[PDB]
Structure formats: structure tokens, C-alpha cells
Design a protein around this ligand. Structure first.
Ligand code: MG
Ligand code: MG
Lengths: 640, 518, 135, 49, 51
């Protein structure tokens, strides 16, 4: 008798048991060593899909640029970045016709928001590339450092309030013959101390710094055998990017196909609505087929030049000042520069020695001293390599930069709905690089033609769909946004329930934030009662261990435990004790929305409540816990 | 108004960043604003070559083939055991305790004190050394742990700290030199990547699956209480919980999971507390049997050596010495990484049984320790399933089916699911057996998780959904199938779970084919 | 660090991870209590907090409820409420924009007042339903 | 050789080489075996005269 | 005297075996001439590093 776990699928649908098929209880595969190699494949891969375009030398930076747009049409089934401008405009024109006034409404709404926007908004985000130090620093730190350096060069506008003057000077800063800024200098005093120093760089150096994108390896990524590269941009492009993403978001919000702006429990509704609508529209006696789609090299075949065209088309009726503002981010992305990792490692086994060759000195060593894969990588990288350790990456995109705009382009291809007036009608859903397509036709053979026509049509817009990762079957069972639908039942089982542990802020808060997540999971992710009950148990065990607050009847020894045990005997009413004070846990499903302080107020003894709730106690981000999520908590001695 | 003027540099970038066929931005701007396309897509599609197409093919049971046929090749070596700790061959020295919580160092000393023959064993009887492990280094290191654990001092720091520098292999580390010398030095070249060996199925992976889903006499899963239940939903939730915990509490996988969580927790506490020193970290657990008696179980000791690295991915050498009662000679191909000594014997139930000591030099990062603490969510993963399964039954018939599903009732026989095969004949099992199998499957995903398991599980999902479509006669189509198979197969290199999972998938696929024929 | 919990786990075991204010109320905590170093001469230990709730002056609490009426209103709405039977049959939930507390798009099958939404987690279910009446 | 010439030609009154770290490996002084405890060597079966 | 010196070329390690510990390692780890010398010296070798 040999146990075969896969046999559970004989008596259960795979969708119902799909949760067990996902290894989300294990370590997310992290990146070990240099991510420099991975960044190089991205550059080689990105240019390999656009080498048939036009190659020229950029006069602003001297880099070797490649432009696959309007290039030769693809001849094979490999990924292709040769998007035809006329085809893209045709899709957008069809898109606008189906939603009259949408482009104008989004442009006007985006502008109104831009006028009111202030510089403090740029402080919201993730790690950004700081040109002053050539490193990665928080958005607030980078914004301040950029602001201070602009003051040195007399570039003002940041203090003027609105984002327009601040973004105006950024463009102005690109013309200054030399740029002065504060740099961190590590002088050896033995000790090493970093100080400020007034550093100066030339105009071309600043141009490259402004266009550069720091590259790391995508860590914690789940569901892939091989790592990749995740890039972050500097402050020079942030502000312009926020507006364009706002512009794309406004358009996408009004699209039925779009599923990227939609978030939460509405995804299940979107899946059900689309399949229901397509089945109803199915011709009598026809066949409705659904394609579980997936795009590979989705970011490496999208062109900033196309996004520049889309921004022009979306803002057709708008002031030139706004049209110029919305067209800057694509301009700074067509001339982007990819900073390559942190070099390579070369070792001698006989001498037991190792050394790190930095990126500027990649080709200073003979290529025969690199392994085969790196040797080939560097041979192909030479044309686009810069002497400062960076590689020119004009074609392609970087994941996560233009997500809303990419969805708009994908939805546009879905709106064609037919080719050659053939006897099929296709539609679907789109969210960033993930899509699902439904085709209705009189028979399967005509349905396949519709899918093949869609495949060819996508190739014309720069959208490549993976044949290896895509499959088709009759409508009613498909997958989208990593969600499984089957016969009217949606089985979202890919989100990993966040570690039900203390949020690490304080005792009363963590209990409030913790109990909020379980409640949200019940409401949103359809988390069941029992599993919700157990999620409470696991968190409490974690909560007591971290905070050293076990039940007063427990035999745990500790510094605070002795005081907790003393309080347990002293207090007459044990049920009123807080969990953090060694009190019993009284949380349940019905009461996942009341702070424990308020819960135990009635049961709390007069002495304990007065001590804990002393108006002037010596121990005393309350709204949102660092993504911003609100939690309900009560001020008290535990709020240190 | 607003005058957002453009500078000289930005304008020049804009001019050169236009699609082919435009000299400058103004030409591009005018073309988009004025020229209208009315069938450019149709013109291009006709002008596009016909060689590019989805080339779709109908999927049939004959199209589907076994995944990774190389796992049956008998020339390849048997996939070895590479988990951090022994799972089914584990032996833990039980010391009955009243229930008081004590420091791990004191727990180890008392457990070893009870077994004085093993603690005092100074002459090692080497059974097999893997390929390069130094028997003298490993044993001398082990005796360091026992002496340090059994000393009167309250610190777990190893007393040698200089023999351990070389016993653990810490001292055999390459020396970094400035870049200029390396550039000049012609003999310095980049190393080739370490390709993982291709192995074949091993009978020890199936055995662990068989053994770790079984019920034992010891339960190690204890959970905090919750508030009183005043609503029917709370009562049914508690009832479903009670049935679930009762069936998973005593499974061997539950005890194994807790040991992994506790060990990785102690490892992480020491990692931050200790940076450049060697520590002994007992591999302990807390268990309670049916009678309610609580035991302290010691599964070995581990030398967490130095660290001197802050971050996510930075190896911290860990040398594990784990007690066991299984002869490594029985399955030689399973322990090519372990140096195991025969350290003594004991009478578990009046019958003599050998006690070996498996030694191995390992490495870990901060993330692995962090995610080791997070191996209890396998409890959440395993349960979320039966909730759905029980819920689906409750939809069919009103009254709760938890009692019916697990034990049956007047109008419903207890639920059964296919669990395994014997002699080529499918076997059925209760809902408890399926629950334990599901829990164990989740645990092995954590234990054997790596880049290979993520790829196989994610890539194999496409095949699983294709088979589901075939079962429902939905007439699935695949644009290409060899490419899908190649992506799945490229991840089957040396991971025990992936190789075994491929064998299980092939077995289940054949059964589905036979069922389809009828 | 990039993980608040782990940073907090390491912070909790530290001797004096809490930042204490300066004042007379901060001087009534003993320097050491049966060995445990509550404070130093400011930094504070979590043991000092545990002592506060155990031994210390009983501060008055008269305006606490008035400051926190909303939460206490939630508590009494739960306490005075009544619970009915449970229906295990399939439920049909209509997506609507509802107010959580006395707004988000949620699936609700029945009363849509904020009183029911606040407890919606314990009422609705894929294959079960419960009858609730807020107090 | 270049370091020696530069050191000699400089105006400093010292014959010290400027690039001491590079000269550590240029002369081969860094490629010296590491002395270890006699106990570890006794246990290491790969250490032979 | 001081004793002998045993080194690992691959590991780039060295260590001096003192006189009392000459026979503490198998003679196969000494070169041929020293191995024969120790084989002949064993009868007259006192267990303190003296002959
Ligand atoms: Mg996606
Ligand atoms: Mg998909």
C-alpha cells in the first residue's frame, strides 16, 4: 500500500484541491550571490527581440539605441517587439469609439489631480535610485537629497508647493552645464566616517544618472525555477510616472475587460460576469471556448515608444502643456540606462583566492576567464556596454513601471473582436501581463481560427502570449489572475495568508492589527469559520511567545512572567485581564471587531483598569500600520 | 495659467525617441493627431507570414505522456536524502516531565543524563563517512556539544572555539583580494555553475509518505484557547476544528513539523544573539501522549557556527548530530551526505535496538530560519481543504455533515477517497487518512521546497488543469505540448519530492487513462 | 529591517527596548523589582510596564467612555444582540456598496445596514447562513 | 618595477613603496600557508610531509 | 628537536608535529626517508620526544 497524494483528484476536482498543489508553506526561492548575471540576460533578451529594428547612436548620451517599432513583421513564433504604430492607433481608435469621451474624461480628471498634487506625494512609494549617492534610498530620503541639491544649483520650485514647478526644474536641471550636490564621502580616520562633500559632475554624467535604473534580483518570488531582475527608477522620473499611471488608471477603471484596478473580492464577480455575458452572447448551437492565457517576455517586448504614442492618442484634445507633461515619462523610458548588478566573482582554487570584478571592469579581463554562459553573455553585451558599468536598454520595459498603461494596450487588442469579418467574436479579461480570452463560433475549428487571429493580432501590438503556458477548452472552466473558475465556482487559492504574527509595533496595537487581518480574510478571501478560528489560535501562540505574556496559570519563567504571575494571583477578576498582561484570550468569530481593552472594561477590576488607563501614564502611526492599513486601538500603558 | 516649458536636453531626447519613420516628435505628434487608420491590422495580418500561428492541436488521452521519463533510468543514482533533519528515521530521547517550561540547555542535559550510556560513549564506531567528511572532526565536534551541554555552566558556547573553526570547515574559506591583483592574476577565472545531478526515483521518498501520514501514540500539537462560543457558527466551527485536530494531532507529520519550527526558532534567536561564536542548539520538542503525560524529546544537537554576515542570504554553517535507530547500510543510496556513528543501544520495549548518530555539515540563511518558524501554516493549508470539502457536503444536505463525513450517520455512509495502490489495485481510505495525507503533502512542500519545487508545482499545474478539462469532456486544446512538458521536466533534477511527485503523477495519469477508457 | 515582527522579536528580548518619558510619574517605578532591572538612569524594560498594571497608583477613569463611545457602542450592539438558527444551504449574495461601521463593495444576502456589515464576517458564508439581530 | 621607480623619483625622503597592498601579492608574500593547531593537523588525514 | 612539518597543498595549510607526537600519525603520512627513519627509531623512542 503506497500512498499517492495525486489520487485525491480522482474523487475531487483539481480546482477544489488546487490549494494543496501550491507550495506556499515553504521558503520563497531567494537570490544567492550576484544579480549581475540576471540583469545581463534581461538586456541580451530585450535586444534579441528587437535586433531587427534600427540601430543608431543617441546624441544626448552616446549610447547605442535599438528601435523595433515599425520594424519588419515577425517571420517565426519567437517573441517579437516589432509593434506597428498604425495597428496600435487603430486599436486605440476602436477603443475610444466603444467608450466615447473616455480619453477626454480621463485626461481632464488626471490633469485636475495633477494641478492639486504637491511635492509631498512623491514621498509615497518604494526604494528609489538616488543620483547623488548612486545607491538605493527611501523616496523621502531621495526627495530631500534631490531638493537640497537643486537649491545649490539655484533650481527652485520644490518650495513653491505644486508639483508642476518641481517637475519643471527637473527638466531645467537637465540643461545645467554642471551639477552640484551633497555626496557621502567615507574618509578613513582606525575608523571610517561618512561625511558630506560638495561634489560636481558634468552635464552628460547627470543625464546618465537621471536616466539610470538600479537593478536587483526579484527575491521572494514564488512559482519560478529561475530568478529575474527587478528595477527601480530615480526621482527624476517618479513625478512624471505618477501622472501617467493616473491617466491610465482612469481609463482602465471604466473598462469592463480591465481587472487590474479592481481589487479585493470584486475579482470573483468580474470572472463570473464575463463568463456569463459571453455564454449569453453565444450563437444558438455554437461553441464558446475560453483560452487560459499567459504572456512571456511581456515587459521585454513592450516599447516605451508605443506608450509615447498612446499618451498622445489619449490626450488628443488637451492643452499642449499637459500633453508635453504626459509624454515625458515615456521619453525618459525610451532612453533608459540599466545599471548592472554589482559585478562578478573570480576565484583561484589552487591559491584559494577570490575577488569581485566590478561592472565598470567587466571587459578589462579576457573573456576566456569567464565560464561559458557568462562568456557568451558578455560577448553579446559588448555593443550596448558603457564604460561606466551600465548597459543601454532602449527597447522593452521594466516590470512594474507602466502597469495600468500596459493593461490598456492589452484591453485594446481585446476590443478588436474580429478579423476579416470572420464568423467568430472574441473577448476576454486583462490585468497587466495576465489575460483570459473567450471565443464564440459555430464550431471548434472556427474558434481556433479566432484564437490564431488573436495571436497574430497581438503580435502586431507587441503583445506576445506563451504557447507553452497557454491552453484552450470549452467555456465554463478557465484561469485568470491566478484564479480558477469551474462551472460557476471560483476557487481563489493562490494568495498566501499573511503570517498571522504580531505586526511588531506594540502590545495593544498588535492585538488590534492581528485580529483585523483574520476578520478581513473571512470577509474577502472566503476564509471559513474553523480555519478562521484556528488562525486566531496560531496568532495568539505567536503573540504570547513574542511578547512574553502567557497565561498566569502557565509555568513559563521570565522577567515579565514573574510579574504576570504576581498580577494573576493579585487580580480578583481574571477574565478582565488583558492578553498582554497574562489575561485569558476571549476573542472569537463573533468578536473580531472590538478592541480587547473595550471588551474587558466591564470585567476589569477597578484597580487594574485605573492602572492600565491612568490618564497620565509614563509610557505614553496610530492610524495606519507600516501599504497603509487602519487598525482600531485604545490608548493605554501598552501603547509605548 | 500653467506654462510647463520644455528644456533643450529633454526636447532632444523626445525627438530621437520616436518610432521609425518620424524625423522628430512634431512629425509623430501630427501623424497621430491627423492620420486615421481604417484597417491597418487587416493589411498587416494579410502581409504577415503564415508561419506564425498558435498551431493548435486537440488534446487527447494519447497525447498526454509520462513526465520525466529519465527518473526511471536505472543508470542514474538514487536521489539522496537532503532534508535538514531526519523525518521518519528520527529518534528522540524521551524524558517524562511534570510540564514546567525549561531552557533548552537544561532539557538536553536531563535527557542525556537519563541516557548515560549514550552520553558517556567516547569510543565512536564509524558506520560510513559520506565522501569527504572527516570522522575525527565530526566526532570531536560532537563530543564538544555533549561536554558543553552537560557542563555546569549556563552558556551553550562551545568550549574549544578553535578546533571548531576547522571541524566545521569555517577556516577553509577563500581570501578576498583587491580587484587590481585579480585582474593582473591570469589564473583567476570565474567558476562554472554547479549543475544539479539527474537522479532516479528512490524508495525512501515513498516510505516517508507512507510513514508520516500514519497515526501515532504521541501528539505534539497544542494550541491556545479561544473565547466561549455563543453562536451556532462558533459551535459548528469548533466541532469541525475538534474533528480536524483529533485526526491530525497524533499524526507523525505533526510532531515532525513542530520539531522543525522549534529548531529554526532557536537557530534564529542564536543567530542574532551570537555572531562570531559557536553554539550548541538542542533539537528538542514537547510532546503529550494519550494519557496526558508530557515528555521532553531530544533529537540531537547542532553546532550553529559563527555567521559574521547580516542580511537575507548569508550561509551560517550548521553541523547536525541526530539520533536514529535505522541502519544506514540498509539503504546506502539514501545517506551519501551523512557520516553516521553507532553510539550505543537502548531497549524501547524490552527489545534491544541500535542507536546511530547521523552527522552532517549544513548551511542556512536568515530567511530559512524565519520561514522555518512559519511551518505551522501547513496546519492552516491542510485545514482550509476539509472546510471546503465539508462545506460542499453541507450544501447538498442541510444538517452538518462533519459527523457524517468523518464517521457517517443514518442517511450517509462515511466519506471515502482513493489514497493509494497496492499490487496495481487502487485502494480507498477514510476522511482521516486523506486529511493526514494532505497535511503530510503540505509539510513536504516546506521541507523540500526550493527553486525546483516551485517550478515543478507551478508548471505541473497546467497539466493538472488540462487533465481536469479532459475528464469533463471539455475538449481542451494545446497550442504546443512538448514545450509545456519540457518546462515541467527541466525542474526534475535532484529534489526528492519533485522526482517522487513525477512518479506519482505518472501513476495517477495511467489510472485516469484506464478510467477514461471505461 | 524589512520585517516588523522579527525586529520586534529581537527587540522584546532586549534589556530596555522601551523609551521612557521624564517626569514624576516616571520616577515612581522602582529601579529594580526582585532582581529585574525595570529601568536605568531614559530607557525602560517591558517588566516595568507589567509592574505598572500590577502595582501603582489607581488612576481615575471618568471620561474614558465619553472619549470612546464608538467602540463601547459596538460592544453593546454585540452584547445585546440575539442569534438565531443556521442555514447550511447555498446562499445568493448580491454585490453592493455597504458601510462597514456606523464604504466597500461586498457580497451581502439580507440586511445591508452598517450594524449587520460590521458583523458580516460571522453571518455570511459560501455554504452556510446565520440569522443575526443587532442589539 | 614601476612602483620602485616612482618611489625613487618622488620628492619624499623615504624609500617606501606606495602600493604596499599590491606589492603584498606581486612579490608572492600573500601566498603563505596558514599555520594551524597540531591537533587539527593530526586529525586531518590529508596533511602529509 | 622541534619536530617535523606536515602541510596540505590543496588546503594551503601547515602544522608542526612536535617530537612527542611523531608516532601519533600513521607513518604513511611521512615521506619515504622520514618513514624509514621513524620505523628504525621506534625501538629507541621514549614517549616524551626523546630517544
Ligand atoms: Mg499578471
Ligand atoms: Mg493566467
Amino acid at each position: 500500500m503506497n500512498i499517492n497524494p495525486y489520487f485525491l483528484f480522482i474523487d475531487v476536482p483539481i480546482q477544489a484541491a488546487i490549494s494543496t498543489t501550491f507550495p506556499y508553506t515553504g521558503v520563497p526561492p531567494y537570490s544567492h550571490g550576484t544579480g549581475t548575471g540576471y540583469t545581463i540576460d534581461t538586456v541580451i533578451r530585450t535586444h534579441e527581440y528587437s535586433n531587427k529594428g534600427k540601430q543608431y547612436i543617441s546624441d544626448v548620451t552616446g549610447c547605442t539605441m535599438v528601435d523595433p517599432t515599425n520594424g519588419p513583421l515577425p517571420e517565426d513564433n519567437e517573441p517579437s517587439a516589432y509593434a506597428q504604430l498604425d495597428c496600435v492607433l487603430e486599436a486605440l481608435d476602436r477603443m475610444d469609439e466603444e467608450h466615447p469621451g473616455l480619453f477626454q474624461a480621463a485626461s481632464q480628471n488626471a490633469m485636475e489631480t495633477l494641478m492639486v498634487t504637491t511635492v509631498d506625494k512623491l514621498t509615497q512609494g518604494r526604494q528609489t535610485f538616488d543620483w547623488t549617492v548612486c545607491r538605493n534610498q527611501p523616496a523621502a530620503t531621495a526627495l530631500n537629497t534631490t531638493i537640497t541639491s537643486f537649491r545649490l544649483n539655484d533650481l527652485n520650485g520644490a518650495d513653491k508647493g505644486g508639483l508642476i514647478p518641481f517637475c519643471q526644474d527637473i527638466i531645467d536641471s537637465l540643461d545645467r552645464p554642471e551639477m552640484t550636490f551633497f555626496s557621502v564621502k567615507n574618509i578613513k580616520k582606525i575608523k571610517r566616517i561618512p561625511m558630506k562633500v560638495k561634489d560636481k559632475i558634468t552635464k552628460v554624467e547627470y543625464i546618465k544618472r537621471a536616466l539610470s535604473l538600479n537593478t536587483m534580483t526579484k527575491d521572494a518570488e514564488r512559482g519560478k525555477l529561475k530568478r529575474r531582475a527587478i528595477a527601480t527608477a530615480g526621482i527624476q522620473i517618479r513625478g512624471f510616472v505618477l501622472v501617467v499611471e493616473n491617466l491610465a488608471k482612469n481609463i482602465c477603471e471604466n473598462l469592463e475587460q480591465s481587472g487590474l484596478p479592481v481589487g479585493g473580492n470584486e475579482k470573483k464577480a468580474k470572472l463570473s460576469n464575463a463568463v456569463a455575458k459571453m455564454l449569453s452572447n453565444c450563437p444558438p448551437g455554437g461553441i464558446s471556448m475560453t483560452v487560459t492565457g499567459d504572456n512571456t517576455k511581456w515587459n521585454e517586448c513592450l516599447n516605451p515608444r508605443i506608450f509615447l504614442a498612446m499618451t498622445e492618442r489619449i490626450t488628443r484634445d488637451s492643452p499642449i502643456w499637459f500633453r508635453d507633461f504626459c509624454s515625458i515619462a515615456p521619453v525618459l523610458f525610451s532612453n533608459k540606462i540599466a545599471r548592472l548588478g554589482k559585478g562578478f566573482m573570480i576565484t583561484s582554487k589552487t591559491k584559494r583566492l577570490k575577488a569581485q570584478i566590478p561592472c565598470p571592469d567587466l571587459f578589462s579581463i579576457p573573456l576566456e576567464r569567464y565560464n561559458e554562459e557568462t562568456r557568451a553573455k558578455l560577448k553579446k553585451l559588448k555593443p550596448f556596454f558603457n564604460e561606466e558599468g551600465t548597459a543601454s536598454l532602449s527597447p522593452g520595459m521594466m516590470m512594474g513601471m507602466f502597469n495600468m498603461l500596459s493593461t490598456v494596450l492589452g484591453v485594446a487588442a481585446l476590443g478588436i473582436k474580429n478579423i476579416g469579418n470572420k464568423e467568430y467574436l472574441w473577448d476576454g479579461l486583462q490585468s497587466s501581463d495576465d489575460f483570459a480570452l473567450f471565443v464564440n463560433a459555430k464550431d471548434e475549428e472556427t474558434c481556433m481560427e479566432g484564437i490564431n487571429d488573436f495571436y497574430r493580432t497581438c503580435k502586431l501590438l507587441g503583445i506576445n502570449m506563451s504557447k507553452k503556458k497557454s491552453y484552450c477548452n470549452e467555456t465554463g472552466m478557465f484561469e485568470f489572475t491566478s484564479m480558477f473558475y469551474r462551472d460557476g465556482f471560483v476557487s481563489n487559492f493562490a494568495m498566501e495568508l499573511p503570517s498571522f504574527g504580531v505586526a511588531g509595533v506594540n502590545e495593544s496595537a498588535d492585538m488590534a492589527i492581528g485580529m483585523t487581518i483574520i476578520k478581513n480574510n473571512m470577509i474577502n478571501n472566503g476564509m471559513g469559520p474553523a480555519t478562521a478560528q484556528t488562525a486566531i489560535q496560531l496568532f495568539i501562540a505567536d503573540y504570547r511567545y513574542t511578547y512574553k505574556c502567557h497565561r498566569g496559570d502557565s509555568k513559563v519563567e521570565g522577567k515579565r512572567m514573574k510579574i504576570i504571575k504576581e498580577l494573576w494571583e493579585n487580580t480578583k477578576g481574571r477574565d478582565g485581564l488583558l492578553v498582554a498582561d497574562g489575561g485569558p484570550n476571549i476573542y472569537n468569530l463573533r468578536n473580531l471587531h472590538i478592541p480587547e481593552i473595550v471588551l474587558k472594561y466591564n470585567l476589569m477590576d477597578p484597580e487594574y483598569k485605573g492602572r492600565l488607563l491612568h490618564p497620565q501614564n509614563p509610557f505614553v502611526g496610530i492610524k495606519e500600520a507600516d501599504k497603509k492599513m487602519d487598525y482600531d486601538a485604545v490608548s493605554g500603558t501598552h501603547s509605548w | 495659467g500653467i506654462d510647463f516649458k520644455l528644456g533643450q536636453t529633454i526636447s532632444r531626447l523626445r525627438d530621437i525617441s520616436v518610432p521609425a519613420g518620424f524625423s522628430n516628435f512634431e512629425g509623430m505628434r501630427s501623424y497621430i493627431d491627423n492620420i486615421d487608420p481604417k484597417g491597418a491590422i487587416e493589411r498587416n495580418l494579410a502581409r504577415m507570414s503564415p508561419l506564425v500561428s498558435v498551431t493548435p492541436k486537440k488534446l487527447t488521452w494519447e497525447d498526454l505522456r509520462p513526465i520525466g521519463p529519465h527518473i526511471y533510468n536505472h543508470e542514474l543514482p538514487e536521489v539522496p536524502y537532503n532534508a535538514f533533519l531526519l523525518m521518519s528515521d528520527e529518534l528522540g530521547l524521551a524524558n517524562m516531565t511534570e510540564g514546567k517550561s525549561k531552557k533548552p540547555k537544561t532539557l538536553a542535559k536531563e535527557c542525556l543524563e537519563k541516557y548515560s550510556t549514550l552520553r558517556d560513549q567516547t569510543d565512536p564506531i564509524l558506520i560510513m563517512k559520506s565522501e569527504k567528511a572527516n570522522e575525527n572532526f565530526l566526532w570531536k565536534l560532537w563530543r564538544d556539544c555533549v561536554n558543553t551541554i552537560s557542563n555546569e555552566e549556563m552558556s551553550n558556547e562551545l568550549q574549544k572555539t578553535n578546533y571548531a573553526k576547522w571541524a566545521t570547515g569555517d577556516g577553509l574559506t577563500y581570501q578576498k583580494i583587491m580587484k587590481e591583483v585579480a585582474i593582473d592574476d591570469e589564473t583567476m577565472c570565474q567558476e562554472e555553475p554547479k549543475i544539479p545531478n539527474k537522479c532516479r526515483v528512490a524508495a525512501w521518498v515513498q516510505t516517508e509518505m507512507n510513514l508520516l501520514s500514519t497515526l501515532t501514540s504521541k501528539r505534539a500539537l497544542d494550541l491556545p484557547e479561544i473565547g466561549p462560543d455563543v453562536a451556532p457558527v462558533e459551535h459548528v466551527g469548533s466541532e469541525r476544528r475538534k474533528y480536524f485536530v483529533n485526526e491530525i494531532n497524533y499524526c507523525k507529520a505533526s510532531t515532525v513539523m513542530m520539531k522543525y519550527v522549534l529548531f529554526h526558532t532557536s537557530l534564529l534567536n542564536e543567530s542574532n544573539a551570537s555572531m562570531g561564536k559557536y553554539k550548541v542548539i538542542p533539537i528538542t520538542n514537547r510532546v503529550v501522549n494519550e494519557k496526558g503525560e508530557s515528555f521532553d524529546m531530544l533529537y540531537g544537537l547542532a553546532v550553529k557556527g559563527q555567521s559574521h554576515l547580516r542580511g537575507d542570504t548569508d550561509v551560517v554553517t550548521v553541523v547536525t548530530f541526530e539520533f536514529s535507530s535505522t541502519d544506514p547500510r540498509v539503504d546506502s543510496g539514501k545517506w551519501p551526505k551523512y557520516t553516521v556513528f553507532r553510539i550505543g543501544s537502548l531497549f524501547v520495549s524490552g527489545r534491544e535496538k541500535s542507536v546511530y548518530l547521523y552527522c552532517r555539515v549544513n548551511g542556512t540563511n536568515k530567511i530559512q530560519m524565519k520561514w522555518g518558524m512559519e511551518a505551522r501554516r501547513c496546519l492552516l493549508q491542510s485545514m482550509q481543504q476539509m472546510e471546503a470539502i465539508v462545506e460542499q457536503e453541507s450544501s447538498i444536505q442541510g444538517y452538518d455533515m462533519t459527523k457524517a463525513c468523518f464517521k457517517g450517520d443514518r442517511v450517509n455512509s462515511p466519506k471515502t477517497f482513493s489514497i493509494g495502490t497496492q499490487e496495481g489495485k487502487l485502494v480507498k481510505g477514510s476522511f482521516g487518512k486523506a486529511l493526514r495525507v494532505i497535511f503530510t503533502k503540505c509539510l513536504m512542500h516546506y521541507v523540500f521546497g526550493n527553486a525546483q519545487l516551485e517550478g515543478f508545482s507551478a508548471e505541473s499545474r497546467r497539466l493538472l488543469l488540462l487533465i481536469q478539462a479532459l475528464k469533463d469532456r471539455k475538449g481542451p486544446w494545446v497550442f504546443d505540448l512538448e514545450g509545456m512538458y519540457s518546462g515541467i521536466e527541466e525542474c526534475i533534477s535532484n529534489n526528492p519530492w519533485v522526482i517522487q511527485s513525477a512518479y506519482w503523477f505518472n501513476e495517477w495519469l495511467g489510472f485516469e487513462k484506464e478510467g477514461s477508457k471505461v | 529591517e524589512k520585517n516588523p515582527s522579527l525586529r520586534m522579536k529581537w527587540a522584546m528580548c532586549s534589556n530596555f527596548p522601551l523609551a521612557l518619558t521624564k517626569g514624576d510619574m516616571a520616577n515612581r517605578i522602582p529601579l529594580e523589582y526582585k532582581g529585574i532591572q525595570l529601568k536605568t538612569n531614559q530607557m525602560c524594560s517591558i517588566a516595568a510596564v507589567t509592574w505598572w498594571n500590577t502595582y501603582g497608583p489607581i488612576g481615575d477613569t471618568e471620561g474614558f467612555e465619553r472619549v470612546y463611545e464608538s467602540f463601547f457602542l459596538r460592544k453593546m450592539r454585540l452584547d445585546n444582540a440575539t442569534w438565531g438558527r443556521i442555514t447550511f444551504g447555498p446562499v445568493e449574495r448580491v454585490r453592493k456598496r455597504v458601510l462597514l461601521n456606523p464604504r466597500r463593495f461586498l457580497p451581502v444576502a439580507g440586511a445591508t445596514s452598517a450594524e449587520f456589515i460590521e458583523m458580516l464576517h460571522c453571518l455570511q458564508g459560501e455554504n452556510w447562513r446565520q440569522i443575526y439581530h443587532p442589539g
